[PDB]
Amino acid sequence: EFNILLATDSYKVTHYKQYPPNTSKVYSYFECREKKVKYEETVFYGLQYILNKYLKGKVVTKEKIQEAKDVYKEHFQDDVFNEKGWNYILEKYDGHLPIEIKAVPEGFVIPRGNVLFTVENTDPECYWLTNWIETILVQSWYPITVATNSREQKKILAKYLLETSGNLDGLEYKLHDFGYRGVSSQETAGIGASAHLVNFKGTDTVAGLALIKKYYGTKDPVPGYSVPAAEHSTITAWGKDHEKDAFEHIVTQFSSVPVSVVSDSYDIYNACEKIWGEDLRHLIVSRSTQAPLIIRPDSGNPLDTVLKVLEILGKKFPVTENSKGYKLLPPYLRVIQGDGVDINTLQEIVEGMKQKMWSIENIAFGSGGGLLQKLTRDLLNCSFKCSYVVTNGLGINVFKDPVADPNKRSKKGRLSLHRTPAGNFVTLEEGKGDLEEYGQDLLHTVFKNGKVTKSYSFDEIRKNAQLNIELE
Amino acid sequence: EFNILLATDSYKVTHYKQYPPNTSKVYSYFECREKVKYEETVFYGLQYILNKYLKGKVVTKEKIQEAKDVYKEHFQDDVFNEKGWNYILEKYDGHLPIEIKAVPEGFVIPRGNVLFTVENTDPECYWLTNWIETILVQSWYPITVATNSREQKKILAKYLLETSGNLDGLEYKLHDFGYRGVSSQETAGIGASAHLVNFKGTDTVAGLALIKKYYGTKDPVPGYSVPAAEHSTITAWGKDHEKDAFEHIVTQFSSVPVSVVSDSYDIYNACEKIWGEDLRHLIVSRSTQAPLIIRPDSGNPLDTVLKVLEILGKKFPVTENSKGYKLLPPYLRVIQGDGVDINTLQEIVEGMKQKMWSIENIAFGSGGGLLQKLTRDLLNCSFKCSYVVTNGLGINVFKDPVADPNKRSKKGRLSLHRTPAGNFVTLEEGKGDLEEYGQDLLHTVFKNGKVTKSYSFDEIRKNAQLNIEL
Ligand SMILES: O=C(NCc1ccc(S(=O)(=O)c2cc(F)cc(F)c2)cc1)c1ccc2nccn2c1
Ligand SMILES: O=C(NCc1ccc(S(=O)(=O)c2cc(F)cc(F)c2)cc1)c1ccc2nccn2c1
């Protein structure tokens, strides 16, 4: 069973002895720090998961305190653990954390360098608790970063889809989550998949569904969808000489729904031109527009291979030219590129298709490692810092400002988030929000004294995270 | 609660319909596929997966109904194999009729070798082998963390040996700072445990309980830490009271090692004037068992380490060790824990060597670099079907994409062997049966719901030792 007393960086166990004596308040904040492919704005998402799963309710017990005491005695080879401090929370608050957390609403899209949430203790005895939970709260970097990077890919797709087709039909199914096997754990799979679903509806990372249902909720039964598809094993199992038999069996099993079939087991170009394009053509041109074959290459240079596949298919199937002048495969036939796709290669592929006069209508993308794993906390510089303390009854504004790196300077004092007169965002420092020159603070209390005080549905989060082009 | 029926890639729900009719066996294998760096991998982490997710009664009536309900909405259709899962529930009390063979945990194996194999043990469950691909492939992560951590240990060992003449302290030279920088609590435990295969220093506390529950050590814990400041415990004192913070903290921890981040405002001033002059008397009085460990945390990592060492060397009595390298007094050390990954680690130790500074002087902390900045395509960790039985006939199967020979997979039943020179070789097409290469080195680790072979964390550590340590 999870123990919050064992869910911090080891050194934080020793910090209660290091703050200035007579310190009654430690106030800290999280931002995606500005840094001197740009990621200028971030989707705030995922805190509600952490608040519910790990922070709310009775999170301290006698047994958990003893467990931590025993572990830390060996881990430090010394008795440094603050048993008294944790006992206090147990006895006074029935094990509920005397912490208040204020946050921007989930789904909100905020420029870099703004306060996204703040954390402070609500009992002077618990001044040490604010930064105890830094480690667990900072893990919000991951769903923020997945959601943000997913949204940036949606912007690219929207731009090219609009240009090549005149509309955004199908946009929310253009980037499918293939990341389940490629992330570092089951828990990460659920969190990351849920973050991608903020922007798209296509996922094979099933773990995302239960997380959303439990922690956020949707009006619809599920937040994300998939359709049948082969993998290499269901093709190769038939034997090298029987690829065509495998293809025929699979498209016939799934004759009335969309089906995707990986086509590069031996020779993608032969598969497209001869097997799909000739031998089994009659099984393809008969399909419903609601049930296309989606051919999947899975190897070679992604751009070169997509273009060659499209060129091959365009000569074996009836291609039209849409109203924008771009080439369009018949509606029973589409392509998915799900190898080597990340934000950079996505851009390269759609730009290359545009240059060769192929509509983005023709293609969807799958992304696994690029979508959910190839991301770090330094992409958006997600960081938690103390900005305000009260010592001997006096508030002081505190910060770091390393001489050799101004990019690591942190904000000072009590913080608040506001709309500017032009409708942008600004973070006010030094308690200046109290002057009330900038309208209402956009941070809302989401956690206080062990209770989650404000929650958002997944539907609301999706609405908040919409693209401008979607609004327009 | 975890449900294995909901722990696969969506499309795999539809695969039972796609295999050749009358297929009784699907046999698959995992390797770190071959492509100059990362030539050998540490096999670690499967035992966690077997125990947490795969063993015992993992199928219930409730889990089947849950999956049925979810997949009906997810696919907007009834494609879920309720019958297949019910069969497992009824026939085997929900235990998976699967056999898994694997190389011992901690083993260091060159790329392109079979690491584990998976097959169904009941013909009715031919579809099950690849259902669990997704969960098993996540073994990539502890493998990759352990391997990358070990590669950093090789670098540290080389430079520590060169500059000091021994390997004293090696196992504390790379500290896990990765807890906040990984993607989840679960990942934190897994990754931290993988790093502990090679080192003993960690702040990622989650790793300790994972090791205790799933692996075990003779010692009470597998990893250790010591007190240290963070920026908040310095900056809280106010900009004009950095010295007061430093003095308070080293006095609170006067008889144990203590690390103090010194770059809140000006690292060079902190080293030369605060530690080097104002508080020098509190440093030179400390025990060899209780050094101050100064932590810079900003600027170019190599340049900052070198400048910090130069500053300290002029304020404190430096010696020259038997190898001709400079050594701070034993009560004073440095830790660099900003921007450290396998590449910058190499750059820093080589730069220190060029400036005649012993690696004895320094330890490294690594967070995102150690536990997060890794993907499955670093070692090309991959699961593929290589053998099937259909209509009672065994068939050797594989992929071999025309445009990428690197993605070619192995054929047939596989086994791992020692060569006459004592290296590893993977035999394909059942050729291990010819017994020309001795016994198969894989062991059955899982069979029909039970873990059949396992390893303590102590044995894993022994298996993963460096040659130079041996
Ligand atoms: O094919 C796979 N899954 C099935 C699949 C099929 C089509 C589409 S689509 O985007 O064309 C699509 C989405 C959708 F929801 C409605 C559609 F009509 C069309 C997406 C996903 C697959 C392949 C490799 C893989 N590696 C890891 C996980 N993986 C899953
Ligand atoms: O200082 C921190 N933790 C404490 C710490 C102190 C010293 C050493 S050491 O390697 O010098 C050392 C290890 C040890 F086990 C025995 C020693 F005597 C010497 C390692 C660790 C710290 C700093 C930043 C941070 N970010 C995330 C987590 N973080 C932890």
From Swiss-Prot, chain A:
Reactions accelerated catalytically: beta-nicotinamide D-ribonucleotide + diphosphate = 5-phospho-alpha-D-ribose 1-diphosphate + nicotinamide + H(+)
* SUPFAM superfamilies in UniProt: Nicotinate/Quinolinate PRTase C-terminal domain-like
Residues binding diphosphate, per UniProt: R181, H232, R296
Q: In the UniProt record, does the keyword Glycosyltransferase occur?
A: yes
* Principal subcellular localisation of the protein: nucleus
Query: What is the activity-regulation note?
Result: Inhibited by FK866. FK866 competes for the same binding site as nicotinamide, but due to its very low dissociation rate, it is essentially an irreversible inhibitor.
**Superkingdom of the organism of origin:** Eukaryota
Provide the E.C. number(s) assigned to this enzyme: 2.4.2.12
InterPro entries per record: Aldolase_TIM (IPR013785), DUF5598 (IPR041529), N/Namide_PRibTrfase (IPR041525), Nicotinamide_PRibTrfase (IPR016471), Nicotinate_pribotase-like_C (IPR036068)
Tell me which residues bind beta-nicotinamide D-ribonucleotide. Answer: D204, R296, P297, D298, G338, D339, G369, R377
- EC category name: transferase
Q: Which UniProt keywords apply?
A: Acetylation, Biological rhythms, Cytokine, Cytoplasm, Glycosyltransferase, Nucleus, Phosphoprotein, Pyridine nucleotide biosynthesis, Secreted, Transferase
- GO BP: cell-cell signaling; circadian regulation of gene expression; inflammatory response; NAD biosynthetic process; positive regulation of canonical NF-kappaB signal transduction; positive regulation of cell population proliferation; positive regulation of ERK1 and ERK2 cascade; positive regulation of gene expression
Family affiliation = Belongs to the NAPRTase family.
Q: What does this protein do?
A: Catalyzes the condensation of nicotinamide with 5-phosphoribosyl-1-pyrophosphate to yield nicotinamide mononucleotide, an intermediate in the biosynthesis of NAD. It is the rate limiting component in the mammalian NAD biosynthesis pathway. The secreted form behaves both as a cytokine with immunomodulating properties and an adipokine with anti-diabetic properties, it has no enzymatic activity, partly because of lack of activation by ATP, which has a low level in extracellular space and plasma. Plays a role in the modulation of circadian clock function.
Self-association and partners: Homodimer.
Can you say what this protein is called? Answer: Nicotinamide phosphoribosyltransferase
